[PDB]
Amino acid sequence: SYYKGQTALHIAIERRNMTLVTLLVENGADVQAAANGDFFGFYFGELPLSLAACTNQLAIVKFLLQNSWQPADISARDSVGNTVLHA
Amino acid sequence: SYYKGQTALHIAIERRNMTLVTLLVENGADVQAAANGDFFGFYFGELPLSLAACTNQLAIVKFLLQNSWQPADISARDSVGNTVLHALVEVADNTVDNTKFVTSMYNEILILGAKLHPTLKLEEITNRKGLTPLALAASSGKIGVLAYILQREIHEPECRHLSRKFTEWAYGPVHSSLYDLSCIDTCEKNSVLEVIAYSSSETPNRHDMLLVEPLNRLLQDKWDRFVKRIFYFNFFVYCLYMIIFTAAAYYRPVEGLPPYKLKNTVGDYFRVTGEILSVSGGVYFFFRGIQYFLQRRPSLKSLFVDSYSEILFFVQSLFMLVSVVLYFSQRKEYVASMVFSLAMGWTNMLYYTRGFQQMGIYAVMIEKMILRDLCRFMFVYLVFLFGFSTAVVTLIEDSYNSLYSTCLELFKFTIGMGDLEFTENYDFKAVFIILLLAYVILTYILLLNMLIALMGETVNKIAQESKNIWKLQRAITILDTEKSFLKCMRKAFRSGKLLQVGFTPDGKDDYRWCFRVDEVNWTTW
Amino acid sequence: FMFVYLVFLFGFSTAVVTLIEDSYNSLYSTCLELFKFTIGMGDLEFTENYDFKAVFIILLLAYVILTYILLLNMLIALMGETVNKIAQESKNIWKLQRAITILDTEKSFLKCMRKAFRSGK
Ligand SMILES: C=C(C)[C@]12C[C@@H](C)[C@@]34O[C@](Cc5ccccc5)(O[C@@H]1[C@@H]3C=C(COC(=O)Cc1ccc(O)c(OC)c1)C[C@]1(O)C(=O)C(C)=C[C@@H]41)O2
Numbered sequence: 001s002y003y004k005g006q007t008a009l010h011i012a013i014e015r016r017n018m019t020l021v022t023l024l025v026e027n028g029a030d031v032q033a034a035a036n037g038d039f040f041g042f043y044f045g046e047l048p049l050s051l052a053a054c055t056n057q058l059a060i061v062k063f064l065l066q067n068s069w070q071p072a073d074i075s076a077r078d079s080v081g082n083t084v085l086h087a
Numbered sequence: 088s089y090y091k092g093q094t095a096l097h098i099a100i101e102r103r104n105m106t107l108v109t110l111l112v113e114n115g116a117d118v119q120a121a122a123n124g125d126f127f128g129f130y131f132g133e134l135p136l137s138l139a140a141c142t143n144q145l146a147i148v149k150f151l152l153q154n155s156w157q158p159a160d161i162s163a164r165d166s167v168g169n170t171v172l173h174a175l176v177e178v179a180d181n182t183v184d185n186t187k188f189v190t191s192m193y194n195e196i197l198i199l200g201a202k203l204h205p206t207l208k209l210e211e212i213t214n215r216k217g218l219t220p221l222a223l224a225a226s227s228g229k230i231g232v233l234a235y236i237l238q239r240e241i242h243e244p245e246c247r248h249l250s251r252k253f254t255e256w257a258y259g260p261v262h263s264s265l266y267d268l269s270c271i272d273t274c275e276k277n278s279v280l281e282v283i284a285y286s287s288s289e290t291p292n293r294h295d296m297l298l299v300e301p302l303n304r305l306l307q308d309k310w311d312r313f314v315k316r317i318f319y320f321n322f323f324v325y326c327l328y329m330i331i332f333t334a335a336a337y338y339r340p341v342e343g344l345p346p347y348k349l350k351n352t353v354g355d356y357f358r359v360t361g362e363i364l365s366v367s368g369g370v371y372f373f374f375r376g377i378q379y380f381l382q383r384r385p386s387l388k389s390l391f392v393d394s395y396s397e398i399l400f401f402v403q404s405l406f407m408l409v410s411v412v413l414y415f416s417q418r419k420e421y422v423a424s425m426v427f428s429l430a431m432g433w434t435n436m437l438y439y440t441r442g443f444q445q446m447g448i449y450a451v452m453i454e455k456m457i458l459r460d461l462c463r464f465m466f467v468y469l470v471f472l473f474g475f476s477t478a479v480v481t482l483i484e485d486s487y488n489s490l491y492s493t494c495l496e497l498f499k500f501t502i503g504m505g506d507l508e509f510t511e512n513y514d515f516k517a518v519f520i521i522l523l524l525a526y527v528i529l530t531y532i533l534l535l536n537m538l539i540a541l542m543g544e545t546v547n548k549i550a551q552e553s554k555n556i557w558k559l560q561r562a563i564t565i566l567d568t569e570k571s572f573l574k575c576m577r578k579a580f581r582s583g584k585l586l587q588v589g590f591t592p593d594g595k596d597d598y599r600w601c602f603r604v605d606e607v608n609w610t611t612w
Numbered sequence: 613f614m615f616v617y618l619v620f621l622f623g624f625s626t627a628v629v630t631l632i633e634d635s636y637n638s639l640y641s642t643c644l645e646l647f648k649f650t651i652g653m654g655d656l657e658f659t660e661n662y663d664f665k666a667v668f669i670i671l672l673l674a675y676v677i678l679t680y681i682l683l684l685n686m687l688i689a690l691m692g693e694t695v696n697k698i699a700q701e702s703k704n705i706w707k708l709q710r711a712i713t714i715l716d717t718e719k720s721f722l723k724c725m726r727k728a729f730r731s732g733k
Pocket residue numbers: 395396397398399400402427430431432434435436437438450451453454457671673674677678
């Protein structure tokens with residue numbers, strides 16, 4: 001609920017940690033999974049790419065989308081239906 | 088007297104002489120002795136340590152307290168009872184430059200108190216008045232010092248055990264916090280809310296002193312939780328009381344002389360119940376008004392400025408006690424008092440419009456235009472009324488046949504309801520017309536439009552601050568409702584929780600009252 | 613302003629009609645006769661005798677001062693503020709009301725929009 005799906009990747013993104021976010025997907029973590037809850041408060045979107053875009057990290061969004069291990073889905077949406085552009 | 092106890096040490100401290108102050112105690116001088124007098128003018132405290140702290144000398148206070156020859160007593164007080172912490176608040180003046188200084192000095196002396204004497208805490212002490220430094224700041228109007236005290240956190244682990252606001256966490260823009268309220272609500276000696284609300288209104292920031300971090304949420308919590316329904320129950324019961332009282336007054340017996348025999352019919356049995364309920368509500372209001380004045384004992388100088396809505400509910404009951412006295416004295420005049428108590432009661436429903444944000448400024452405007460604008464305009468208008476009335480009634484002695492009748496007939500000219508007839512012949516009728524034409528121009532046109540333009544300014548000045556006026560009137564209601572019923576406060580659970588979140592340097596776990604709050608600010612990333 | 617004024621009207625009206633039970637002979641008639649005092653169209657006569665006439669005059673004089681002078685000039689000063697606040701933005705108000713009309717007219721007739729050629733090209 002409150003922490004449904006949230007991982008150290010989200011905390012690092014919110015903390016402006018370039019090394020932590022890089023290592024998260026380097027190990028093999030998948031960013032497609034999204035974290036949702038009552039707190040998600042400040043609504044920055046559920047997709048990690050949306051969170052990174054909204055949190056003033058263009059390097060992070062570029063890395064997530066370009067990631068060869070698992071590129072982020074630009075057109076993903078939450079259960080409600082808001083997209084990254086909507087966020 | 089003037090120089091009682093003052094030494095070269097005090098002069099050096101005031102002169103910013105580090106060498107002189109050092110040598111003073113190096114020779115063997117004792118700082119415990121304090122100098123007091125009529126001049127002590129600028130009150131910086133009697134203790135030399137207080138003077139040094141107030142005079143922007145942190146090095147000097149540190150030297151005095153650390154002095155191996157004779158360390159200063161941090162918790163000393165004067166004859167009156169003000170401590171160094173009290174002196175720090177006494178010298179604040181709400182200005183931006185002064186606030187940072189006084190807060191810094193307060194913080195430094197507090198940290199020194201903990202480092203030197205962890206066992207003892209210096210903020211809890213009270214002066215002769217019996218109000219703690221935060222209470223003193225609230226009562227005296229020092230919004231800056233109060234804001235600093237209420238929300239301050241020390242991140243040093245050793246010095247983090249005496250903070251008020253234990254931040255719980257921050258997650259992006261939102262910064263959840265956990266305030267103390269350990270002596271804000273339900274503190275025996277005094278509460279920081281009570282002194283803010285029950286102020287002379289000469290205190291400057293009381294309107295804006297309820298925007299401080301914990302107080303706003305604390306009051307909006309008591310309102311939303313339980314008080315907002317007690318207030319509406321009270322309003323509904325007063326509405327029932329006024330409807331019953333109006334019905335019983337309207338249908339009163341008219342043939343005979345009081346008291347009246349109880350006719351054996353439903354219509355006349357209901358009327359006696361209405362009379363009984365109306366009188367009982369007139370004793371409840373009487374006792375509530377008496378109790379208000381006993382507890383508060385407001386100054387007779389400011390009886391109407393601060394307790395305008397409590398004088399009126401007391402008068403609206405005095406008029407009915409005076410009618411039940413005259414009703415059993417076989418006097419028909421009890422009606423002349425009852426209907427005055429009836430018009431009082433209906434217009435007293437504007438007291439309950441402070442439970443509505445938008446509707447609560449009409450009550451404030453009516454109150455403020457009767458006391459300020461309309462009260463001091465009655466000496467200006469009455470000289471005109473009594474001068475042009477004596478003049479008019481003396482001229483035509485030979486409607487305008489009496490002083491009462493002439494005063495009435497000229498009052499209607501002021502408010503535009505009078506007729507300039509001149510039909511009835513009078514001796515000296517060219518000077519009577521001139522007198523009346525002068526009166527109408529002076530009062531109706533010139534002088535009544537001055538009042539209308541001065542009340543407009545009042546309305547304009549107190550219609551901008553509607554948010555400020557509303558919240559204080561709501562805080563007063565919350566305080567009164569909370570204090571009305573003891574079990575209400577007992578079962579209110581006003582504090583968010585009673586939790587143990589840290590340990591004091593003494594090694595014993597400390598549990599205190601606290602209340603979580605939240606705020607949003609992302610501009611700083 | 614109708615909850616503020618009606619407590620005064622109904623309080624000084626019940627008071628006036630209760631006092632003189634022994635124009636102001638009914639609740640409707642007293643409410644009407646005191647409403648005209650508020651708007652300056654009423655007459656303070658006191659010609660007809662009443663029991664307790666020194667407290668009836670006091671009641672009516674209080675009502676006129678409170679409503680006609682004090683309380684009606686509060687409404688007149690509060691509406692002046694509204695007029696002043698929405699007379700500065702006339703350009704802003706006008707264009708939105710014009711946009712609503714344009715939208716309604718366009719949506720009213722389908723062939724109108726079809727043949728409008730709204731887009732430049
Ligand atoms: C205690 C005071 C000052 C007061 C008591 C009475 C006599 C009062 O006249 C005044 C003076 C006055 C009289 C006549 C015209 C204007 C002013 O004002 C009120 C008082 C003035 C009004 C009440 O108008 C209000 O201000 C209602 C009100 C506003 C704000 C409130 O917080 C409030 O709480 C109860 C009530 C009408 C009378 O109360 C009323 O009903 C009658 C018949 C007399 C009015 O004296």
